[PDB]
């Protein structure tokens, strides 16, 4: 029938900007520049963004708007054979909501811990410390910074877990933290995009205020120029390496967030004739611009540390949670007005992650609401139920061995799941559905057909770009390990279910529906390859 639409155009954009701008923007991108060729990394990064990244991002938004339905239904109406794709994508988003919100919880945890004259992670003399603790980061693994032990031996208590097999006690400060996260998500996603679309105003915009303050604070710091030097100093030697092109391609793909049905779902609330193509480019750019800016926020502080604090740069320049919960707060505590930098820093983290979590959850609620009217009829129940399921299982993430759980999901929730899922999205759209049909759909919406540029990216470049990621990442495969702990064979295989459970939906739904329709093989292919709007 007629679905609701965004209260206003900025509600959509801030929702998409919000979903896309994420912790990866902060902890992975600047590190990738530093790691490969400095400023030169922007060359392979930019090309990968142009040919691979945005075309996928653009695709998902266009489809979501035009078919005016969530992921399950939309792919049902597009290529019924491949309706499984919709299932896969929605399923992947599902698994991720389990481990991802614990990041926001850690953020809230450090925020609550940040009200004080003296930040707890500064020194080495606390009860949780070990004799091997030192004040700042080093390159010897047995000896950890005072900030690393705070996070590890106090906040996480990971030192008390012998592996994933041993989870240990439930930390109720984290259990409480995780709850507050889902409470915030609840009364955000509660009534749908009417309220949700407003909430993103704070959670999308806040990080930029806090990036601004910390960008100034960081640049006014002694040594801050040395940092920018480490961040952006060109070396084009790196550009010649395959590893660099894989890192660029890979960061770009996971940054713009295709494959969760979130872009799809969000756009489905757009007015049919609005210019999505303008939106995809504006949203894309704001996403990468944010990562670029963020790099300065980090490495300015990173330089301050290498200058006044006497640490080797390679020791403090790192990716993932370590940068944000260990390295950066270490610098913050050394500077004047530390408590203020801490509070706004951690709030920025939480508000960086919440928009993302919102969008992912919405990809589910929307996708199911469009398939099962019973769900559509009562939203408040469904999401209360869903988040309750998230909370309960997520307590595994608040145990003492919880990180081991978090890390496991992080790898297998979708690494390869989302890569194939998008690979079928592209192949289905470009070949089975046809590009000329997609293009004709877009011209009807915007007024003009996509250039032959996008059509070549959708039909050829992207899929190649996609398996370029997977192949060069497959050959580099190594069994799951975190920090001298080697995950057991069984836990590894437990992950591959989680990985494969979504992707099988594609051939599984194809198999089921191919055998649920009559006629010959040739004529039941044509039945399942004919789109909903053609009938």
């Amino acid at each position: 029938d007629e679905r609701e639409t965004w209260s206003g155009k900025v509600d959509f954009l801030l929702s998409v900007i919000g979903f896309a701008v994420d912790l990866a923007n902060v902890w992975r991108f600047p590190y990738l520049c530093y790691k490969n060729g400095g400023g030169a990394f922007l060359v392979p990064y930019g090309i990968m963004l142009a040919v691979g990244g945005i075309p996928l991002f653009y695709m998902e938004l266009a489809l979501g708007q035009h078919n005016r339905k969530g992921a399950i239904t939309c792919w049902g109406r597009l290529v019924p054979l491949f309706k499984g794709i919709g299932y896969a994508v929605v399923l992947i988003a599902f698994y991720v909501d389990f481990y991802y919100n614990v990041i926001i919880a850690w953020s809230l945890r450090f925020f609550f811990a940040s009200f004080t004259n003296s930040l707890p992670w500064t020194s080495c003399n606390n009860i949780w410390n070990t004799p091997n603790c030192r004040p700042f980061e080093g390159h010897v693994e047995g000896f950890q910074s005072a900030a690393s032990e705070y996070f590890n031996r106090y906040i996480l208590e990971l030192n008390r877990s012998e592996g994933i097999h041993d989870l240990g006690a439930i930390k109720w400060d984290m259990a409480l933290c995780l709850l507050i996260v889902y409470l915030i998500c609840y009364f955000s996603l509660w009534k749908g995009i009417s309220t949700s679309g407003k909430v993103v105003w704070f959670t999308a915009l806040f990080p930029y205020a806090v990036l601004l303050i910390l960008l100034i604070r960081g640049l006014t710091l002694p040594g801050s120029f040395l940092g920018i030097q480490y961040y952006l100093t060109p070396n084009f030697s790196a550009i010649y390496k395959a590893e660099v092109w894989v890192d660029a391609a890979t960061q770009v793909f996971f940054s713009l967030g295709p494959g969760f049905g979130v872009l799809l779902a969000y756009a489905s609330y757009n007015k049919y004739h609005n210019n999505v193509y303008k939106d995809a480019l504006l949203t894309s750019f704001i996403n990468s611009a944010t990562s670029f800016i963020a790099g300065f926020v980090i490495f300015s502080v990173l330089g301050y540390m290498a200058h006044t604090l006497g640490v080797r740069i390679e020791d403090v320049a790192t990716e993932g949670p370590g940068l944000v919960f260990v390295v950066y707060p270490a610098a913050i505590a050394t500077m004047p007005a530390s408590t203020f930098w801490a509070l706004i820093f951690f709030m920025m983290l939480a508000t960086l992650g919440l928009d993302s979590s919102f969008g992912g959850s919405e990809a589910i609620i929307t996708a199911l609401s469009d398939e099962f009217p019973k769900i559509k009829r009562n939203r408040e129940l469904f999401v209360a139920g869903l988040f309750s399921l998230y909370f309960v299982v997520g307590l595994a993430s608040c145990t003492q061995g919880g990180f081991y759980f978090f890390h496991l999901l992080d790898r297998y929730a979708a690494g390869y799941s989302i890569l194939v899922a998008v690979f079928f999205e592209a192949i289905a759209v470009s070949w089975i559905y046809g590009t000329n049909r997609f293009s004709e759909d877009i011209r009807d919406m915007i007024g003009f057909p996509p250039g032959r540029y996008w059509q070549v990216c959708w039909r050829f470049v992207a899929p190649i770009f996609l398996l370029f990621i997977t192949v060069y990442g497959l050959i580099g495969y190594e069994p799951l390990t975190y920090a001298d702990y080697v995950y057991p064979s069984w836990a590894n295989a437990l992950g591959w279910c989680i990985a494969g459970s979504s992707v099988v939906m594609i051939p599984a739904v194809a198999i089921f529906k191919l055998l649920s329709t009559p006629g010959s093989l040739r004529q039941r292919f044509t039945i399942l390859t004919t789109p909903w709007r053609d009938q």
Partner: antibody
Framework: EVQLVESGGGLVKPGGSLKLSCAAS????????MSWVRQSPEKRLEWVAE????????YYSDTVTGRFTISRDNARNILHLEMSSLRSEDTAMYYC????????????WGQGTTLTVSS | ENVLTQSPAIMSTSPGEKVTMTCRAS???????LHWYQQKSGASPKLWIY???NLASGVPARFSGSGSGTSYSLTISSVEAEDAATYYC?????????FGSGTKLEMKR
């Protein structure tokens, strides 16, 4: 290079029906939405119907809606307008016009073909 | 329908003089969807200006166009007798598509 040629059309009794064709050449005809624009003897330009590249999207003016049917042959590169229960007010020269990008308007027009509706 | 009215209906001009014609829509039109056609006597229309300011292929630089919302105009800076024709404006903004009432440019002598 790009040529558009309308044909069909002539005298028809009121209430009758008739079928116009536009022969396209000089470009991939499948890549372009087309429209029929007509000009009355009083020289008023009026748009009639538009058909997409793959002819999955079709728009009509209110004046001709339900009597006229626009169609497309992408193999033979032809454009069609099938008119029924014609009225005197449908008298006009009929123009086959090509435009795909709305922001660019109609970038090529045919010579036209004349339809006269009189008892 | 969005009705586009043009003025004047007819106008005469001596070559070299500057001519201006206006187009007024009953409802607002995005400047990207407003176009202009020149039709010479006894021949078929030709796309002249598109997206309100843009000259089509083959259009002399002495032509220009401007406007927004409900009011647009086509302008010939220095007229040539070659320019005597009827000018139509069109909006591709919404269906049904509509052409303005036209302006007949005739030469003065």
């Amino acid at each position: 290079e790009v040529q558009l040629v309308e044909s069909g059309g002539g005298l028809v009794k009121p209430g009758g029906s008739l079928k116009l064709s536009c022969a396209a050449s000089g470009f991939t005809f499948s890549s372009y939405a087309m429209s029929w624009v007509r000009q009355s003897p009083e020289k008023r330009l009026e748009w009639v119907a538009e058909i997409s590249s793959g002819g999955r999207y079709i728009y009509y003016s209110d004046t001709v809606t339900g009597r006229f049917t626009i169609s497309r042959d992408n193999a033979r590169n032809i454009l069609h307008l099938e008119m029924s229960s014609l009225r005197s007010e449908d008298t006009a020269m009929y123009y086959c016009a090509r435009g795909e990008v709305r922001q660019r308007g109609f970038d090529y027009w045919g010579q036209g073909t004349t339809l006269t509706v009189s008892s | 329908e969005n009705v586009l009215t043009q003025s004047p209906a007819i106008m005469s001009t001596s070559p070299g003089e500057k001519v201006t014609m206006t187009c007024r829509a009953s409802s607002s039109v995005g400047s990207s969807y407003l176009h202009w056609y020149q039709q010479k006597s006894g021949a078929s229309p030709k796309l002249w200006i598109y997206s309100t300011s843009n000259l089509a292929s083959g259009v002399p630089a002495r032509f220009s166009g401007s406007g927004s919302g409900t009011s647009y105009s086509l302008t010939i800076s220095s007229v040539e007798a070659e320019d005597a024709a009827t000018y139509y404006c069109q909006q591709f903004s919404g269906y049904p598509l509509t052409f303005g009432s036209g302006t007949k440019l005739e030469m003065k002598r």
